[PDB]
Ligand SMILES: [K+]
């Protein structure tokens with residue numbers, strides 16, 4: 172599996188399973204319902220501040236949530252970055 | 264906890280590589296590299312792919328250095344005490 176999920180869609184499923192609305196989740200974590208709506212739709216990133224608030228509501232660590240976002244962003248780049256012409260200066 | 268740009272700067276210094284030469288190698292503008300090295304802009308996912316190609320390790324590693332930096336500015340700052348952890352036992356203040 173090359174394509175991986177935006178963390179918003181994992182959150183959306185957890186909220187569905189718990190019977191928790193986007194608005195109620197936003198009020199619990201202390202952000203606007205508009206922010207949550209965009210996050211759940213995968214239209215905005217799970218930022219460092221959001222990761223702290225989300226870990227407090229859904230568990231694990233802020234680092235976990237951020238890692239999911241980073242992983243999504245890398246795979247979304249697809250073929251955009253040709254690395255074949257980049258000379259290795261370090262060690263790999 | 265240093266910004267990852269300043270870690271890169273030290274590596275470039277050790278290799279005798281200017282910021283401009285590094286920018287040309289990784290395929291971005293010297294302005295972008297200059298801002299990164301000064302800690303004035305974030306190490307993004309696209310940059311992490313290019314940087315991993317030039318300096319080694321994985322894109323995820325460079326992104327983790329950036330995340331660590333960002334979270335160190337905030338984990339001591341944001342009050343989570345009002346946030347319910349769903350499914351946990353109700354809080355009981357003594
Ligand atoms: K995979």
Ligand SMILES: [K+]
Pocket residue numbers: 184185187188
């Ligand atoms: K479910």
Ligand SMILES: [K+]
Pocket residue numbers: 194195198
């Ligand atoms: K409310």
Ligand SMILES: [K+]
Pocket residue numbers: 232233234334338
């Ligand atoms: K942490």
Ligand SMILES: [K+]
Pocket residue numbers: 270271274
């Ligand atoms: K280093």
